[PDB]
């Protein structure tokens, strides 16, 4: 595993998150449930708790967007980069954006599995860097394992716990 330079991490006991925009590909409630699942996958391993807010600023702002969308990291259309996120910090720090040009799915159809992508992106929101282990969720490419049957690997758990304790 790897962490960001200077090991940025949240210092608060609770981290807030807000889903600012949704994808037309999935019901809103599915995205809400999948984001909660992704966050608790990492949450189960560490001393951290999350709270969803529906207005204003939240630590972790989540949204879908296509092409250029403010942050100077424009999406590229279908394929290639699927989503991206930023290390803990203020503003853009900790946020996670998903490329709306991708066909998102909960796993019951063809497309990119939103739960797998969200677990990877929120790992960055929490301070995780990319891993060299093809089995880790933090590996940089999508599709090595099974997007519909996965769990954090020992490499991922080792990293998050090094960052926040057990
Ligand atoms: C892990 C995922 C949730 C988020 C990551 C990016 C990321 O790590 N965000 O935090 C991602 O999108 N990885 C690309 C990496 C990638 C693979 N190729 C690329 C060609 C061009 C640009 C990028 C890529 C080869 C062709 C296949 C393109 C379609 C699949 N794309 C990927 O696997
Ligand atoms: Ca894309
Ligand atoms: Ca933020
Ligand atoms: Zn962005
Ligand atoms: Zn990544």
UniProtKB/Swiss-Prot annotation:
Intracellular or extracellular location(s): Secreted, Extracellular space, Extracellular matrix
Q: Which GO terms describe its biological process?
A: antibacterial peptide biosynthetic process; antibacterial peptide secretion; collagen catabolic process; defense response to Gram-negative bacterium; defense response to Gram-positive bacterium; extracellular matrix disassembly; extracellular matrix organization; membrane protein ectodomain proteolysis
Binding-site positions, Ca(2+) 2: 76-77, 79, 81, 99, 102
Give residues annotated as binding Zn(2+) 1.
Answer: 69, 71, 84, 97
Where in the sequence is the active site? 121
| Enzyme class at the top of the EC tree | hydrolase
Q: Which reaction does it catalyse?
A: Cleavage of 14-Ala-|-Leu-15 and 16-Tyr-|-Leu-17 in B chain of insulin. No action on collagen types I, II, IV, V. Cleaves gelatin chain alpha2(I) > alpha1(I)
Gene Ontology CC annotations of this record: extracellular exosome; extracellular matrix; extracellular region; extracellular space
Name the coenzymes or cofactors required.
Ca(2+); Zn(2+)
Which GO molecular function annotation, any one, does this entry have?
metalloendopeptidase activity
Please give the coiled-coil regions recorded for this protein. none
UniProt-annotated binding residues for Zn(2+) 2: 120, 124, 130
Q: Is Metal-binding included in the keywords of this UniProt record?
A: yes
EC number(s) per UniProt? 3.4.24.23
Alphabetically list the UniProt keywords. Answer: Calcium, Collagen degradation, Extracellular matrix, Hydrolase, Metal-binding, Metalloprotease, Protease, Secreted, Signal, Zinc, Zymogen
Q: According to its UniProt entry, what is the function of this protein? A: Degrades casein, gelatins of types I, III, IV, and V, and fibronectin. Activates procollagenase.
Report the family membership: Belongs to the peptidase M10A family.
What UniProt notes about the protein's domains is: The conserved cysteine present in the cysteine-switch motif binds the catalytic zinc ion, thus inhibiting the enzyme. The dissociation of the cysteine from the zinc ion upon the activation-peptide release activates the enzyme.
Tell me the protein's name. Matrilysin
To which species is this protein native?
Answer: Homo sapiens (Human)
Q: What lineage does UniProt assign to this protein's organism?
A: Eukaryota, Metazoa, Chordata, Craniata, Vertebrata
